[PDB]
PDB file of C-alpha atoms and ligand atoms in Angstrom:
ATOM      1  CA  UNK A   1      93.961 112.612 102.448  1.00 58.88           C
ATOM      2  CA  UNK A   2      93.102 108.945 101.654  1.00 57.04           C
ATOM      3  CA  UNK A   3      95.604 107.420 104.155  1.00 56.86           C
ATOM      4  CA  UNK A   4      94.530 109.831 106.894  1.00 59.58           C
ATOM      5  CA  UNK A   5      90.862 109.012 106.500  1.00 61.11           C
ATOM      6  CA  UNK A   6      91.770 105.290 106.450  1.00 62.83           C
ATOM      7  CA  UNK A   7      93.827 105.611 109.672  1.00 66.22           C
ATOM      8  CA  UNK A   8      90.928 107.476 111.299  1.00 63.42           C
ATOM      9  CA  UNK A   9      88.556 104.677 110.217  1.00 65.27           C
ATOM     10  CA  UNK A  10      90.885 102.021 111.701  1.00 66.12           C
ATOM     11  CA  UNK A  11      90.699 103.913 115.007  1.00 67.72           C
ATOM     12  CA  UNK A  12      86.939 103.882 114.945  1.00 69.51           C
ATOM     13  CA  UNK A  13      87.034 100.083 114.347  1.00 68.96           C
ATOM     14  CA  UNK A  14      89.293  99.705 117.397  1.00 68.86           C
ATOM     15  CA  UNK A  15      87.257 102.027 119.633  1.00 70.05           C
ATOM     16  CA  UNK A  16      84.115  99.995 119.041  1.00 66.70           C
ATOM     17  CA  UNK A  17      85.770  96.721 120.106  1.00 66.22           C
ATOM     18  CA  UNK A  18      84.437  95.141 123.314  1.00 67.79           C
ATOM     19  CA  UNK A  19      87.755  95.565 125.175  1.00 66.08           C
ATOM     20  CA  UNK A  20      88.659  99.075 124.120  1.00 68.82           C
ATOM     21  CA  UNK A  21      87.716 101.176 127.170  1.00 70.97           C
ATOM     22  CA  UNK A  22      91.089 101.184 129.002  1.00 71.10           C
ATOM     23  CA  UNK A  23      92.876 102.273 125.826  1.00 73.98           C
ATOM     24  CA  UNK A  24      90.711 105.181 124.711  1.00 76.13           C
ATOM     25  CA  UNK A  25      92.470 108.001 126.475  1.00 76.36           C
ATOM     26  CA  UNK A  26      95.874 108.687 128.023  1.00 77.64           C
ATOM     27  CA  UNK A  27      96.545 106.961 131.321  1.00 78.77           C
ATOM     28  CA  UNK A  28      96.027 109.574 134.069  1.00 79.75           C
ATOM     29  CA  UNK A  29      98.348 107.918 136.495  1.00 77.49           C
ATOM     30  CA  UNK A  30      98.042 110.663 139.083  1.00 74.83           C
ATOM     31  CA  UNK A  31      94.250 110.250 139.225  1.00 74.80           C
ATOM     32  CA  UNK A  32      94.757 106.451 139.576  1.00 72.65           C
ATOM     33  CA  UNK A  33      97.474 106.878 142.193  1.00 72.49           C
ATOM     34  CA  UNK A  34     100.050 104.999 140.137  1.00 73.08           C
ATOM     35  CA  UNK A  35     103.156 107.085 140.643  1.00 72.51           C
ATOM     36  CA  UNK A  36     105.482 104.545 139.030  1.00 72.65           C
ATOM     37  CA  UNK A  37     103.621 104.488 135.731  1.00 72.39           C
ATOM     38  CA  UNK A  38     105.879 107.065 133.978  1.00 71.07           C
ATOM     39  CA  UNK A  39     109.004 105.422 135.371  1.00 72.20           C
ATOM     40  CA  UNK A  40     108.100 102.132 133.744  1.00 72.18           C
ATOM     41  CA  UNK A  41     106.226 103.329 130.652  1.00 73.34           C
ATOM     42  CA  UNK A  42     108.619 105.595 128.806  1.00 76.73           C
ATOM     43  CA  UNK A  43     106.440 106.276 125.767  1.00 78.07           C
ATOM     44  CA  UNK A  44     102.772 106.495 126.749  1.00 77.13           C
ATOM     45  CA  UNK A  45     100.231 106.076 123.930  1.00 75.14           C
ATOM     46  CA  UNK A  46      96.447 105.699 123.574  1.00 74.90           C
ATOM     47  CA  UNK A  47      93.802 105.817 120.879  1.00 74.10           C
ATOM     48  CA  UNK A  48      92.855 109.484 121.347  1.00 72.88           C
ATOM     49  CA  UNK A  49      96.489 110.553 121.083  1.00 71.37           C
ATOM     50  CA  UNK A  50      96.877 108.541 117.877  1.00 71.62           C
ATOM     51  CA  UNK A  51      93.804 110.336 116.524  1.00 70.49           C
ATOM     52  CA  UNK A  52      95.461 113.704 117.241  1.00 68.12           C
ATOM     53  CA  UNK A  53      98.606 112.530 115.538  1.00 67.77           C
ATOM     54  CA  UNK A  54      96.600 111.570 112.401  1.00 69.98           C
ATOM     55  CA  UNK A  55      95.005 115.045 112.365  1.00 71.40           C
ATOM     56  CA  UNK A  56      98.525 116.621 112.506  1.00 71.08           C
ATOM     57  CA  UNK A  57      99.913 114.358 109.743  1.00 68.92           C
ATOM     58  CA  UNK A  58     102.397 112.445 111.903  1.00 71.04           C
ATOM     59  CA  UNK A  59     102.015 109.167 110.005  1.00 74.91           C
ATOM     60  CA  UNK A  60     103.482 109.436 106.500  1.00 75.79           C
ATOM     61  CA  UNK A  61     103.880 105.664 106.227  1.00 74.77           C
ATOM     62  CA  UNK A  62     101.452 103.109 107.553  1.00 72.05           C
ATOM     63  CA  UNK A  63     104.144 101.321 109.583  1.00 70.63           C
ATOM     64  CA  UNK A  64     104.443 104.476 111.816  1.00 68.89           C
ATOM     65  CA  UNK A  65     100.674 104.315 112.546  1.00 67.78           C
ATOM     66  CA  UNK A  66     100.848 100.631 113.388  1.00 68.99           C
ATOM     67  CA  UNK A  67     103.892 101.169 115.597  1.00 69.04           C
ATOM     68  CA  UNK A  68     101.892 103.525 117.772  1.00 69.15           C
ATOM     69  CA  UNK A  69      98.939 101.069 117.867  1.00 67.30           C
ATOM     70  CA  UNK A  70     101.337  98.272 118.950  1.00 67.42           C
ATOM     71  CA  UNK A  71     102.848 100.590 121.568  1.00 66.27           C
ATOM     72  CA  UNK A  72      99.514 100.877 123.387  1.00 67.65           C
ATOM     73  CA  UNK A  73      99.346  97.101 123.950  1.00 67.60           C
ATOM     74  CA  UNK A  74     103.084  96.929 124.744  1.00 69.35           C
ATOM     75  CA  UNK A  75     102.763  99.507 127.480  1.00 68.46           C
ATOM     76  CA  UNK A  76      99.893  97.657 129.057  1.00 73.72           C
ATOM     77  CA  UNK A  77     101.715  94.284 128.943  1.00 72.57           C
ATOM     78  CA  UNK A  78     104.916  95.848 130.325  1.00 74.63           C
ATOM     79  CA  UNK A  79     103.252  97.658 133.266  1.00 76.25           C
ATOM     80  CA  UNK A  80     100.587  95.162 134.363  1.00 76.96           C
ATOM     81  CA  UNK A  81     100.697  91.551 135.496  1.00 76.43           C
ATOM     82  CA  UNK A  82      99.675  88.936 132.927  1.00 79.33           C
ATOM     83  CA  UNK A  83      96.839  87.714 135.186  1.00 75.64           C
ATOM     84  CA  UNK A  84      95.242  91.203 135.412  1.00 75.61           C
ATOM     85  CA  UNK A  85      92.070  91.931 133.476  1.00 79.11           C
ATOM     86  CA  UNK A  86      93.543  94.975 131.688  1.00 83.01           C
ATOM     87  CA  UNK A  87      96.450  92.863 130.444  1.00 83.85           C
ATOM     88  CA  UNK A  88      94.033  90.290 129.069  1.00 84.18           C
ATOM     89  CA  UNK A  89      91.994  93.116 127.489  1.00 84.34           C
ATOM     90  CA  UNK A  90      95.146  94.290 125.715  1.00 81.68           C
ATOM     91  CA  UNK A  91      95.808  90.814 124.341  1.00 82.44           C
ATOM     92  CA  UNK A  92      92.353  90.712 122.810  1.00 81.31           C
ATOM     93  CA  UNK A  93      92.778  94.225 121.387  1.00 81.58           C
ATOM     94  CA  UNK A  94      96.165  93.285 119.984  1.00 82.32           C
ATOM     95  CA  UNK A  95      94.744  90.199 118.246  1.00 83.27           C
ATOM     96  CA  UNK A  96      91.868  92.244 116.801  1.00 83.44           C
ATOM     97  CA  UNK A  97      94.259  94.981 115.683  1.00 82.14           C
ATOM     98  CA  UNK A  98      96.505  92.417 114.009  1.00 80.38           C
ATOM     99  CA  UNK A  99      93.427  90.984 112.143  1.00 78.57           C
ATOM    100  CA  UNK A 100      92.625  94.534 110.944  1.00 81.28           C
ATOM    101  CA  UNK A 101      96.175  95.104 109.788  1.00 83.50           C
ATOM    102  CA  UNK A 102      96.072  91.802 107.883  1.00 81.83           C
ATOM    103  CA  UNK A 103      92.799  92.783 106.116  1.00 81.35           C
ATOM    104  CA  UNK A 104      93.596  96.299 105.093  1.00 82.54           C
TER     105      UNK A 104
ATOM    106  CA  UNK B   1      91.850  84.801  99.777  1.00 81.16           C
ATOM    107  CA  UNK B   2      88.590  86.638  99.206  1.00 81.79           C
ATOM    108  CA  UNK B   3      87.116  83.891 101.428  1.00 81.44           C
ATOM    109  CA  UNK B   4      89.848  84.631 103.954  1.00 81.76           C
ATOM    110  CA  UNK B   5      89.058  88.378 103.750  1.00 85.02           C
ATOM    111  CA  UNK B   6      85.378  87.632 104.467  1.00 83.46           C
ATOM    112  CA  UNK B   7      86.349  85.478 107.476  1.00 84.99           C
ATOM    113  CA  UNK B   8      88.549  88.271 108.764  1.00 85.75           C
ATOM    114  CA  UNK B   9      85.659  90.684 108.437  1.00 84.82           C
ATOM    115  CA  UNK B  10      83.564  88.420 110.597  1.00 83.76           C
ATOM    116  CA  UNK B  11      86.321  88.195 113.215  1.00 84.37           C
ATOM    117  CA  UNK B  12      86.210  91.973 113.520  1.00 86.71           C
ATOM    118  CA  UNK B  13      82.415  92.181 113.607  1.00 81.18           C
ATOM    119  CA  UNK B  14      82.085  89.462 116.244  1.00 80.99           C
ATOM    120  CA  UNK B  15      84.368  91.415 118.601  1.00 78.32           C
ATOM    121  CA  UNK B  16      82.412  94.660 118.409  1.00 77.09           C
ATOM    122  CA  UNK B  17      80.742  95.933 121.560  1.00 77.74           C
ATOM    123  CA  UNK B  18      77.195  95.407 120.231  1.00 80.24           C
ATOM    124  CA  UNK B  19      77.689  92.068 118.462  1.00 78.34           C
ATOM    125  CA  UNK B  20      76.097  89.550 120.894  1.00 78.00           C
ATOM    126  CA  UNK B  21      72.513  89.508 119.557  1.00 75.69           C
ATOM    127  CA  UNK B  22      73.805  88.917 116.021  1.00 76.08           C
ATOM    128  CA  UNK B  23      76.233  86.027 116.604  1.00 74.28           C
ATOM    129  CA  UNK B  24      73.796  83.154 116.108  1.00 75.97           C
ATOM    130  CA  UNK B  25      70.508  82.504 114.382  1.00 79.29           C
ATOM    131  CA  UNK B  26      67.437  83.871 116.174  1.00 76.57           C
ATOM    132  CA  UNK B  27      65.864  80.955 118.023  1.00 78.92           C
ATOM    133  CA  UNK B  28      62.420  82.511 118.073  1.00 80.81           C
ATOM    134  CA  UNK B  29      60.795  79.433 119.651  1.00 85.28           C
ATOM    135  CA  UNK B  30      63.279  79.615 122.565  1.00 87.89           C
ATOM    136  CA  UNK B  31      62.506  83.358 122.922  1.00 87.63           C
ATOM    137  CA  UNK B  32      58.747  82.851 122.728  1.00 88.84           C
ATOM    138  CA  UNK B  33      58.448  85.137 119.678  1.00 91.14           C
ATOM    139  CA  UNK B  34      55.999  83.280 117.423  1.00 92.64           C
ATOM    140  CA  UNK B  35      55.622  86.173 115.037  1.00 92.21           C
ATOM    141  CA  UNK B  36      59.333  86.446 114.165  1.00 89.09           C
ATOM    142  CA  UNK B  37      59.142  84.278 110.988  1.00 84.39           C
ATOM    143  CA  UNK B  38      55.905  86.010 109.989  1.00 85.04           C
ATOM    144  CA  UNK B  39      57.836  89.251 109.818  1.00 85.47           C
ATOM    145  CA  UNK B  40      61.413  88.277 109.076  1.00 87.28           C
ATOM    146  CA  UNK B  41      61.183  86.175 105.941  1.00 86.99           C
ATOM    147  CA  UNK B  42      64.932  85.755 105.277  1.00 87.73           C
ATOM    148  CA  UNK B  43      66.752  85.242 108.620  1.00 84.09           C
ATOM    149  CA  UNK B  44      70.497  85.852 108.812  1.00 85.96           C
ATOM    150  CA  UNK B  45      73.250  85.999 111.500  1.00 88.94           C
ATOM    151  CA  UNK B  46      77.032  86.073 111.695  1.00 86.64           C
ATOM    152  CA  UNK B  47      77.532  82.331 112.298  1.00 84.65           C
ATOM    153  CA  UNK B  48      75.413  81.446 109.263  1.00 84.14           C
ATOM    154  CA  UNK B  49      77.461  83.863 107.144  1.00 83.07           C
ATOM    155  CA  UNK B  50      80.595  82.114 108.378  1.00 84.33           C
ATOM    156  CA  UNK B  51      79.237  78.734 107.227  1.00 83.31           C
ATOM    157  CA  UNK B  52      78.418  80.265 103.832  1.00 82.43           C
ATOM    158  CA  UNK B  53      81.964  81.603 103.524  1.00 87.07           C
ATOM    159  CA  UNK B  54      83.299  78.101 104.230  1.00 84.94           C
ATOM    160  CA  UNK B  55      80.878  76.570 101.646  1.00 81.75           C
ATOM    161  CA  UNK B  56      81.939  79.065  98.897  1.00 83.44           C
ATOM    162  CA  UNK B  57      78.531  80.676  98.513  1.00 83.27           C
ATOM    163  CA  UNK B  58      79.896  84.190  97.975  1.00 84.54           C
ATOM    164  CA  UNK B  59      81.233  84.454  94.420  1.00 84.89           C
ATOM    165  CA  UNK B  60      81.479  88.248  94.710  1.00 83.60           C
ATOM    166  CA  UNK B  61      82.018  90.526  97.675  1.00 83.13           C
ATOM    167  CA  UNK B  62      78.646  92.198  97.166  1.00 83.35           C
ATOM    168  CA  UNK B  63      76.936  88.845  97.945  1.00 87.87           C
ATOM    169  CA  UNK B  64      78.797  88.632 101.302  1.00 87.98           C
ATOM    170  CA  UNK B  65      77.964  92.206 102.188  1.00 86.16           C
ATOM    171  CA  UNK B  66      74.311  91.742 101.208  1.00 87.49           C
ATOM    172  CA  UNK B  67      73.983  89.013 103.822  1.00 86.32           C
ATOM    173  CA  UNK B  68      75.753  91.263 106.391  1.00 87.53           C
ATOM    174  CA  UNK B  69      73.229  94.032 105.513  1.00 85.91           C
ATOM    175  CA  UNK B  70      70.391  91.509 105.920  1.00 84.36           C
ATOM    176  CA  UNK B  71      71.243  90.955 109.612  1.00 80.93           C
ATOM    177  CA  UNK B  72      70.756  94.630 110.440  1.00 80.28           C
ATOM    178  CA  UNK B  73      67.721  94.944 108.163  1.00 82.10           C
ATOM    179  CA  UNK B  74      65.950  92.085 109.862  1.00 81.35           C
ATOM    180  CA  UNK B  75      66.587  93.550 113.272  1.00 77.59           C
ATOM    181  CA  UNK B  76      65.360  96.993 112.264  1.00 76.41           C
ATOM    182  CA  UNK B  77      62.247  95.638 110.523  1.00 72.79           C
ATOM    183  CA  UNK B  78      61.144  93.473 113.484  1.00 70.40           C
ATOM    184  CA  UNK B  79      62.024  95.558 116.533  1.00 65.85           C
ATOM    185  CA  UNK B  80      60.819  99.008 117.706  1.00 67.94           C
ATOM    186  CA  UNK B  81      63.278 101.793 117.043  1.00 64.12           C
ATOM    187  CA  UNK B  82      63.302 102.525 120.797  1.00 64.69           C
ATOM    188  CA  UNK B  83      64.481  99.009 121.686  1.00 62.90           C
ATOM    189  CA  UNK B  84      68.055  98.327 122.742  1.00 59.54           C
ATOM    190  CA  UNK B  85      68.576  95.639 120.083  1.00 58.41           C
ATOM    191  CA  UNK B  86      67.498  98.005 117.306  1.00 61.19           C
ATOM    192  CA  UNK B  87      70.008 100.558 118.549  1.00 58.96           C
ATOM    193  CA  UNK B  88      72.678  97.846 118.711  1.00 54.53           C
ATOM    194  CA  UNK B  89      72.023  96.910 115.108  1.00 55.76           C
ATOM    195  CA  UNK B  90      72.455 100.553 114.020  1.00 54.00           C
ATOM    196  CA  UNK B  91      75.887 100.666 115.646  1.00 53.44           C
ATOM    197  CA  UNK B  92      76.867  97.350 114.117  1.00 52.20           C
ATOM    198  CA  UNK B  93      75.629  98.524 110.689  1.00 50.48           C
ATOM    199  CA  UNK B  94      77.649 101.731 110.844  1.00 50.01           C
ATOM    200  CA  UNK B  95      80.831  99.825 111.789  1.00 51.08           C
ATOM    201  CA  UNK B  96      80.240  97.227 109.121  1.00 52.99           C
ATOM    202  CA  UNK B  97      79.636  99.815 106.433  1.00 52.16           C
ATOM    203  CA  UNK B  98      82.802 101.682 107.352  1.00 50.47           C
ATOM    204  CA  UNK B  99      84.742  98.437 107.279  1.00 51.86           C
ATOM    205  CA  UNK B 100      83.401  97.610 103.804  1.00 52.70           C
ATOM    206  CA  UNK B 101      84.501 101.052 102.612  1.00 50.97           C
ATOM    207  CA  UNK B 102      88.040 100.290 103.870  1.00 50.24           C
ATOM    208  CA  UNK B 103      88.288  97.106 101.706  1.00 50.68           C
TER     209      UNK B 103
HETATM  210  C1  R78 C 201      97.440 102.262 134.294  1.00 52.48           C
HETATM  211  C2  R78 C 201      97.527 100.781 134.475  1.00 52.48           C
HETATM  212  C3  R78 C 201      96.468 100.018 133.688  1.00 52.48           C
HETATM  213  C4  R78 C 201      96.636 100.272 132.202  1.00 52.48           C
HETATM  214  O1  R78 C 201      97.604  99.746 131.629  1.00 52.48           O
HETATM  215  N1  R78 C 201      95.728 101.079 131.526  1.00 52.48           N
HETATM  216  C5  R78 C 201      95.885 101.266 130.098  1.00 52.48           C
HETATM  217  C6  R78 C 201      94.701 101.718 132.200  1.00 52.48           C
HETATM  218  C7  R78 C 201      93.941 102.724 131.662  1.00 52.48           C
HETATM  219  N2  R78 C 201      92.877 103.261 132.311  1.00 52.48           N
HETATM  220  C8  R78 C 201      92.582 102.724 133.477  1.00 52.48           C
HETATM  221  N3  R78 C 201      91.493 103.184 134.152  1.00 52.48           N
HETATM  222  C9  R78 C 201      90.458 104.126 133.880  1.00 52.48           C
HETATM  223  C10 R78 C 201      90.299 104.720 132.653  1.00 52.48           C
HETATM  224  C11 R78 C 201      89.264 105.613 132.433  1.00 52.48           C
HETATM  225  C12 R78 C 201      88.384 105.929 133.485  1.00 52.48           C
HETATM  226  C13 R78 C 201      87.250 106.922 133.292  1.00 52.48           C
HETATM  227  C14 R78 C 201      88.509 105.321 134.734  1.00 52.48           C
HETATM  228  C15 R78 C 201      89.583 104.456 134.958  1.00 52.48           C
HETATM  229  O2  R78 C 201      89.891 103.893 136.156  1.00 52.48           O
HETATM  230  C16 R78 C 201      89.247 102.671 136.463  1.00 52.48           C
HETATM  231  N4  R78 C 201      93.237 101.731 134.112  1.00 52.48           N
HETATM  232  C17 R78 C 201      94.307 101.240 133.490  1.00 52.48           C
HETATM  233  N5  R78 C 201      95.079 100.340 134.158  1.00 52.48           N
HETATM  234  C18 R78 C 201      94.664  99.605 135.361  1.00 52.48           C
HETATM  235  C19 R78 C 201      93.318  98.847 135.259  1.00 52.48           C
HETATM  236  C20 R78 C 201      92.764  98.867 136.701  1.00 52.48           C
HETATM  237  C21 R78 C 201      93.721  99.503 137.550  1.00 52.48           C
HETATM  238  C22 R78 C 201      94.587 100.414 136.646  1.00 52.48           C
HETATM  239  C1  R78 C 202      64.432  88.277 118.065  1.00 54.58           C
HETATM  240  C2  R78 C 202      64.188  89.762 118.265  1.00 54.58           C
HETATM  241  C3  R78 C 202      65.459  90.514 118.665  1.00 54.58           C
HETATM  242  C4  R78 C 202      66.452  90.496 117.517  1.00 54.58           C
HETATM  243  O1  R78 C 202      66.201  91.072 116.482  1.00 54.58           O
HETATM  244  N1  R78 C 202      67.600  89.715 117.656  1.00 54.58           N
HETATM  245  C5  R78 C 202      68.541  89.667 116.556  1.00 54.58           C
HETATM  246  C6  R78 C 202      67.791  88.920 118.809  1.00 54.58           C
HETATM  247  C7  R78 C 202      68.734  87.934 118.891  1.00 54.58           C
HETATM  248  N2  R78 C 202      68.978  87.260 120.012  1.00 54.58           N
HETATM  249  C8  R78 C 202      68.275  87.588 121.078  1.00 54.58           C
HETATM  250  N3  R78 C 202      68.483  87.011 122.299  1.00 54.58           N
HETATM  251  C9  R78 C 202      69.383  86.029 122.783  1.00 54.58           C
HETATM  252  C10 R78 C 202      70.455  85.569 122.048  1.00 54.58           C
HETATM  253  C11 R78 C 202      71.300  84.583 122.560  1.00 54.58           C
HETATM  254  C12 R78 C 202      71.103  84.057 123.811  1.00 54.58           C
HETATM  255  C13 R78 C 202      72.004  82.975 124.312  1.00 54.58           C
HETATM  256  C14 R78 C 202      70.029  84.522 124.577  1.00 54.58           C
HETATM  257  C15 R78 C 202      69.166  85.497 124.086  1.00 54.58           C
HETATM  258  O2  R78 C 202      68.088  86.000 124.744  1.00 54.58           O
HETATM  259  C16 R78 C 202      67.862  85.622 126.090  1.00 54.58           C
HETATM  260  N4  R78 C 202      67.314  88.539 121.120  1.00 54.58           N
HETATM  261  C17 R78 C 202      67.069  89.222 119.989  1.00 54.58           C
HETATM  262  N5  R78 C 202      66.024  90.037 119.939  1.00 54.58           N
HETATM  263  C18 R78 C 202      65.343  90.593 121.131  1.00 54.58           C
HETATM  264  C19 R78 C 202      66.243  91.272 122.151  1.00 54.58           C
HETATM  265  C20 R78 C 202      65.591  91.066 123.464  1.00 54.58           C
HETATM  266  C21 R78 C 202      64.413  90.185 123.277  1.00 54.58           C
HETATM  267  C22 R78 C 202      64.524  89.579 121.934  1.00 54.58           C
END
């Protein structure tokens, strides 16, 4: 109970960050016309999906939660060029996520 | 350590969507709002809190969080509930309170 509520509160903190928009929901690559997205990104992840995993008790150690958080930023930095805005957004989200992990 | 925790809290709050109005002291003269100090008698903002962290003014966490609360209180006391800044301060307050509960 305590850990789950905590993970859910971490997600709220991340959602309300200035750069969170691109990471809120699964990438709908078909809608975006990005057919290669699933070829390059083998393990898609996003904040909404993490929330569903919390509700289903998929994180029985905190490191499993943080691995999925890290995976979101990894996917973005793998797929997109460093100079792109979404890449830069993911760097700022990653730094903020790491500050939260250090605090908690 | 506790000082470092407080600094890390401010890092999180500064990067929230609605943080911009709260980053620096209200310069009411620059804004033309002569009545601000007649209404807000104890100004506070995130940069000032940061200076207080550095100067060791928070001997207990409740003192830090009281100054955080004061930011949102001032905004809500001064501004109409229908104003955008008031609404911003409510979102900041809810995020801050949840963060405190996590620590
Ligand atoms: C998939 C590649 C990359 C990425 O890594 N992520 C996470 C991503 C997630 N979501 C979006 N986009 C949208 C999300 C929600 C809505 C509603 C509309 C969106 O389209 C603008 N774009 C993303 N981009 C790129 C950024 C601009 C071009 C595509
Ligand atoms: C003072 C009343 C109220 C408030 O409570 N806060 C905290 C506030 C703080 N900062 C600002 N404004 C600015 C801050 C930094 C810069 C740079 C420029 C600003 O305005 C041009 N406005 C604030 N408002 C109002 C919101 C719209 C009108 C005034």
